[model samples]
Structure formats: structure tokens, C-alpha cells
Target: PQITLWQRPLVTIKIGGQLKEALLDTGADDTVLEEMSLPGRWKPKMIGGIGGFIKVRQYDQILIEICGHKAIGTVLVGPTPDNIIGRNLLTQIGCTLNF
Candidate 1:
């Protein structure tokens, strides 16, 4: 889908049988989701935060649906007020920030 640059790149997504909204953060290197009551087997990890590093749960091979495209990638479930999908999963859906 061709996104217009006139607005913030927030879009809808689906995962773990739940539909949610998130930011299409093209500049981010990884995808981050808010800690929901979802079941998953994950490993403990610390990721780079905007202010610093924070501990999070990194789930592997998660199938996430973007708009209408389904793809697999890594996702981090942690404490955040916003859900953001980064380039790691964005690239899987043939998305780019071409201006």
C-alpha cells in the first residue's frame, strides 16, 4: 500500500488472534509491541530504547499480519505505551520509506 506522507504512518496489524494499531516506524531497526496478555515462548533480551537500553522478551518466528500481508519476524513484548513495527518486519512486506 502506498502511504501518504501528509500524516503519521500509523496502521493496523494483527497478531496472536488480536487486532491492534501500531506505527510503521521505518527508521527503527526492530519491531516492538506492548506487553499484552498473549502466550508465547520467548528469550530474555535487552533492546536499545530511545533513551537507553531496556529488558524485554524477544519472541522468535512470530507471524504478524500487516495490513493484508502476512509475514514472520522477531517481536519484542515489553513495557511501552505505543506499539511500533520496525524495518525488521516492515522489509518482509516489501515496504520502504522511499520519498
Candidate 2:
């Protein structure tokens, strides 16, 4: 879907606890969590990544909330130059990122 730069509120869930202020990103494929921000039970699992010689780790599931809607899904953790909202979340909610 068409999207613009927009900042919407989202729930940040990790091994420790749940947080708020996640940005909505429609360009990303899966829920991307900051490796530094994760908490309890946040076991890292490595899997096939974008390209060869590169591996990606994913957790079983994370609990997240948006506009009172909640879901549990695979957790994709990574490092980022900055925080972002991705397509994994936007497509499910029918939302586009707008600035």
C-alpha cells in the first residue's frame, strides 16, 4: 500500500516487559526489535538471513499492542542506526507510515 512518513504509537514488547512508542513502518517485513532493548526470556535464535554469510536470529513470539489491538508473533531482533516501524506490523493493521 501507499505510505508516507508518519509516526504512530505502538507497543514495544521484550523479554522483560512491554513498552510503548513503537513507530509504524509499512516497508519492513517482520517485527524488528532492538537487540539492546530486549528483556527476559528473550532467547536469540539464528536463522537464514537476507544474504549468504549472514545469519538472523528470531525469537518465538512477542506480545505487542497497537490502538488496543494485540498479537503474538515471531520476534526478529537486530541492531539499527535508529528505531523504525516496519511492514510486518503495518500490513496487519492496515496502516501506512506517514510523516
Candidate 3:
């Protein structure tokens, strides 16, 4: 199955038992989500972006559902305008770019 990449490359995904609209960012290496309450303890880490750096809680082995496809991987919870699905989980779902 293939999906066309929109100008925004956005899709609805379920994370932490909640549905959220996220950007399919191939450029990103890890998935980042906006502030939310997640179960269990997380390790502290700093993530760098175009707008400098932001502290995030790194939750490992989290389950994320994208278009009915489920992938368990790492998810970073922090302050972000939009949730981003990066290469980590993207690769699990066999997402590829075609020209």
C-alpha cells in the first residue's frame, strides 16, 4: 500500500491511547509529540530543532498507530506545535518516497 505525500505530509495517528494529527517528516529521526501525560517514567533529554533546543521526555518502546498500521518505537514528549512521525516508526510501516 502507498500513500501520497501532501504538501503538509500530515496524517492522523494514535499515540498514548489518543488520536492526534501528525506530520510525516522524513527529515526527522525521532517522533516528537506535544505535551501530554504518559504512563511510566521517562529519561530526560534535549532535542535540537530549527528553533534551538527543547527538553523532552524520551519514552521508549511506545506503541503508535498510523492509518491502522501499528508500530512500537520511541516517542519524545515535549512542547511542539504539531506531532511529528519520523523515520523511526515510518520505516516500520514501510513508508518510502517515490519520485
Candidate 4:
């Protein structure tokens, strides 16, 4: 079973020099950073995932500090339906997701 964000760990990240709170999503296959609550320059790129090719714009890899983990990665940009706790960052912690 995959872990959901019920009372999951929260991470702090720097976007354009501001610290923001982000949920740790172990179910999401990729990192999806949003801009609605952040201020920064946008970048365009293309990625191929489980759904094939995806056009990504206005996204970036930011320095984030989680419970005790830290990394720089690029996530999909825009607002998510919910504050996710996805796979992008969770894999680094060593727990596997079985969906």
C-alpha cells in the first residue's frame, strides 16, 4: 500500500528566496512544483513518464529540506488538486509504493 498525506511529513523549500511548505508525496511518480504560491522564473522542458511524453513549462528544481532529507529536483508546475505527498521525494527515504 502507498502512503497518503494524512499526517505525513512536511518539507521546506526555497523558491526565489522564500521558504515554502510542501507535503511529501510518495504516491506521485514525479515532482510537480506549483507557481500559484511561489514566485520565480519558469523553465520549459519535456519528459516521458508512465503516460508517455509530457510538456512541462514554468517548472524548476529547488533546494528542499525535508524531515532530514535534502535534494534539488524539478517538478511539474501548477496547482495540484491537493497538497501531495508523492513518490518524487519519497523514494529517497527508502519506502516502496505498492498501488
Candidate 5:
């Protein structure tokens, strides 16, 4: 099913058995989430965004669910207004721009 892009394409996503809302960002190269408890040690990294760069914890092989479709990929946890679902996971669920 095709989802229409809103001013911010918000959608429901399940991370680590927890359900949370996320913005589907096609422009983002990586998915970022609000600070949360995650297992294992992650390498620290910085990512450049619309504003500037911010430090993030890079966690690999994290399970994420979108629209009932599940996929494993990297998810960055950091200080963000909302969870961001990038192309890494979006492509798994077959999301595409209709316009």
C-alpha cells in the first residue's frame, strides 16, 4: 500500500518491542531516534543534518517494524525531536514517491 507524504510523513514504528511514532524522511541517509536504552556497546559518530552535525550512538542490526513489515538495520540514537525513519528501512517496506 502506498502512503501519501504529509508535511512530515509520520508513521508508527516498533523498535526493540516498543512502539513509537517516527517521521519517514527520504532525504535522511540514516535513521535517528530519541535517546533510548539499547543493548551492546556502540561506536560514537557524528551526522550532518539540515542544521548541523550532532553526536550519535550507532547501533547495528536493530529490528524495526513499519506497517507490519519488519527489517533489520542500523539505527542511531541521539537527541532528536522525533524518531526518523530513513531510506534504509523505507526501502525494505517498498515506500516510493508517487509524485
Candidate 6:
């Protein structure tokens, strides 16, 4: 599906039997979810975007279904204002940005 730049580009995603709304953020390198428990193995991780650095819990090998497409990837549980579906999953679903 083609999306324009004028919108938030929010999509439905399923993870750990929970459905959520997440943003398709092309500027993000990693997928970040709000504070939630999935019972997966995690480790302390730090990441920074265009802003400052912050700490997060990184969980690898997480199965997340986005818009009916399922993929296993790494998710960071942190204080993100929104659940972000970043390049990691976007690339999996063959996402491309066009003008």
C-alpha cells in the first residue's frame, strides 16, 4: 500500500496477542514499543535518534504482525510517546518512500 507524507501513517500491529497502533517511521532505525511485558529475554540497551540518548530494554526474536504481515525482530521497550514500526520491520515488508 502506498502512503503519503501528510499523515501519521499509523497501522495496526499485533504482538504477544495484543493489538496496537504504531507509526511507520522511516527515520527510525529500530522498532520501539511502549512499556509492556512479553516474557521474552531482554537486556539493557541504549539508543538515540536526532535527540538525546536514553535507555531501553531490548528484546530480540519477537514475533510481531503488522497489517497482517508477521515478522520476527528486535523491539525496544522504552518511554517512546508512540509505538514505532521502524526500518527493521518496514524493510521486511518492502517499504519504500516516494514523493
- Evaluation by lDDT, superior candidate among 1 and 6: 6
Stretches of model 4 off by over 4 angstroms after superposition: 1-9, 36-61, 83-85, 93-99
lDDT of 3 by residue, 1-99 (tens): 566755687788888779889988998898999898789789999988898998999999888898779999989999877899999999999899999
Instruction: Give residue 99's error in model 1 in angstroms.
Output: 2.3
Model 6, TM vs. native:
0.93
| lDDT by residue (tens digit), candidate 1, 1-99 | 789878988889999899999999877788889987567789999888668887889988988998989999899999766899998998899997665
Tens digit of lDDT per residue, candidate 6, span 2-65?
7776788999999988989999998899999998878867999999976688799999999999
In model 3, what lDDT does residue 64 have? 87
Q: What stretches of model 6 exceed 4 Å from their correct place? A: none
Q: How many steric overlaps are in each model, in order? A: 0, 13, 0, 11, 0, 0
In terms of lDDT, model 1 sits at: 0.86
Question: Ten residues in a row with the worst lDDT in model 6?
Answer: 47-56
RMSD (Cα, Å) for all candidates, in order, is: 1.2, 5.3, 1.3, 5.4, 1.3, 1.1
Task: Return the TM-score for each candidate structure.
Answer: 0.91, 0.53, 0.91, 0.51, 0.91, 0.93
- In order, candidate lDDTs are 0.86, 0.52, 0.88, 0.56, 0.86, 0.90
Candidate 3 Cα errors over 4 Å, as ranges: none
lDDT of model 1, residue 63: 88
Tens-digit lDDT string for candidate 2 (21-91): 56554555666566545544555555333452223356555666655566666666666433444666556
Which structure among the candidates has the greatest TM-score?
Answer: 6
